[PDB]
Design an enzyme around this catalytic site. Structure first.
Site, PDB file in Angstrom:
ATOM      1  N   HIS A 137       0.808  -1.210   0.000  1.00  0.00           N
ATOM      2  CA  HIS A 137       0.000   0.000   0.000  1.00  0.00           C
ATOM      3  C   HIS A 137       0.844   1.264   0.000  1.00  0.00           C
ATOM      4  CE1 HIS A 137       0.350  -0.251   4.529  1.00  0.00           C
ATOM      5  NE2 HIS A 137       0.449   1.059   4.358  1.00  0.00           N
TER       6      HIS A 137
ATOM      7  N   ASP B 149       0.127  -7.800   1.826  1.00  0.00           N
ATOM      8  CA  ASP B 149       0.538  -6.402   1.737  1.00  0.00           C
ATOM      9  C   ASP B 149       2.059  -6.319   1.715  1.00  0.00           C
ATOM     10  OD1 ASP B 149       0.534  -3.620   1.700  1.00  0.00           O
ATOM     11  OD2 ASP B 149      -0.145  -3.388   3.760  1.00  0.00           O
TER      12      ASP B 149
ATOM     13  N   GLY C  49       2.821   6.351   8.726  1.00  0.00           N
ATOM     14  CA  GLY C  49       4.173   6.651   8.296  1.00  0.00           C
ATOM     15  C   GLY C  49       5.163   5.547   8.591  1.00  0.00           C
TER      16      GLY C  49
ATOM     17  N   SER D  99       4.328   2.250   7.927  1.00  0.00           N
ATOM     18  CA  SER D  99       4.067   1.106   7.055  1.00  0.00           C
ATOM     19  C   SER D  99       5.262   0.745   6.221  1.00  0.00           C
ATOM     20  CB  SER D  99       2.944   1.297   6.066  1.00  0.00           C
ATOM     21  OG  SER D  99       1.789   1.667   6.796  1.00  0.00           O
ATOM     22  N   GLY D 100       5.378  -0.549   6.009  1.00  0.00           N
ATOM     23  CA  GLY D 100       6.463  -1.090   5.257  1.00  0.00           C
ATOM     24  C   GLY D 100       7.710  -1.271   6.070  1.00  0.00           C
TER      25      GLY D 100
END
Length: 222
Positions: A41, A85, A174, A176-177
Site C-alpha cells: 500500500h 501487503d 508513516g 508502514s512497510g
C-alpha cells in the site's frame, strides 16, 4: 510509532526511508543490496529510497539516496482486505554497505520461537506529530486466535499481530512497510492496526514475511 523512544544510532542499519515529493511516506527494509522490502500500500509513482538515515532532517555522512527503478507488488495483494501487503523495490544501484547500511535476514520459519520483537520507524508518535529521529519500541507477538478475536474476519495466514498490553506501544501512520524484527530476523512489515494507534486492546497487524520466501527469492533471482 507511539509510546516508544529514539533508537540507538547503530542498531538499525537495515531501515529504509521511503520518500515521495521530498517527504517521508513509508518505511522499508533493506533485504539485499539491490532490494528494499515494504508494504504494497506504499506504492506511489516516483518513490525515493534513503538508506543509512537516523535523523531525517540532517544530511548524514552515512546516508545513501536511490531512485526506485522497479516496484513489484505481490500478485495476490488485495488492497480492500490488506491481504498480502508486500512489495519489492529494486534500487537503481546496489547499496554500498557499511556499519550503518546492512541487509536484514528474513525469518523463513513461520513457527519461529522468538515472540518479543522490535518495531522501528519515523511514523506518527504519541503527541500526534512526526519525529525527526527514528523511533523504536519493544513489543510482543500475539497468537492468531487472539488477533482474530480483536479483528473478526480480517486476519489471514499472511498477517501476524503484535502489541504491548501495558503501554500500548504500536506502529502508526508513516511506519508502514517498516520492520518487525524478532530474534534479529525480519518477521513482519508494518501493515495496519487500530485507530487511534495504540495496542493495549487491539494489536498491530503486520505482513507475515515468512510466507513470502519463495516469491522474494524468485523476484530477486530473475
Amino acid at each position: 510509532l507511539v509510546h516508544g523512544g529514539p533508537c540507538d544510532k547503530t542498531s538499525h542499519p537495515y531501515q529504509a526511508a521511503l520518500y515521495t515529493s521530498g517527504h517521508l511516506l513509508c518505511g522499508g527494509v533493506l533485504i539485499h543490496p539491490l532490494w528494499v522490502l515494504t508494504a504494497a500500500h506504499c506504492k506511489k509513482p516516483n518513490l525515493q529510497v534513503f538508506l543509512g538515515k537516523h535523523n531525517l532532517g540532517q544530511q548524514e555522512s552515512s546516508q545513501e539516496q536511490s531512485s526506485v527503478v522497479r516496484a513489484v507488488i505481490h500478485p495476490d495483494y488485495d488492497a480492500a482486505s490488506h491481504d498480502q501487503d508486500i512489495m519489492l523495490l529494486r534500487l537503481a544501484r546496489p547499496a554500498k554497505l557499511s556499519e550503518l547500511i546492512q541487509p536484514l535476514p528474513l525469518e523463513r520459519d513461520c513457527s519461529a520461537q522468538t515472540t518479543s520483537c522490535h518495531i522501528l520507524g519515523w511514523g506518527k508518535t504519541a503527541d500526534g506529530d512526526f519525529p525527526d529521529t527514528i523511533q523504536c519500541a519493544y513489543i510482543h507477538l500475539v497468537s492468531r486466535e487472539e488477533c482474530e478475536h480483536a479483528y473478526p474476519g480480517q486476519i489471514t495466514q499472511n498477517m501476524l499481530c503484535a502489541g504491548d498490553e501495558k503501554y500500548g506501544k504500536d506502529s502508526c501512520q508513516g511506519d508502514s512497510g517498516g520492520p518487525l524484527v524478532c530474534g534479529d530476523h525480519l518477521r513482519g512489515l508494518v501493515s495496519w492496526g487500530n485507530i487511534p494507534c495504540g495496542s493495549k486492546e487491539k494489536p498491530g497487524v503486520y505482513t507475515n514475511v515468512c510466507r513470502y520466501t519463495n516469491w522474494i527469492q524468485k523476484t530477486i533471482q530473475a
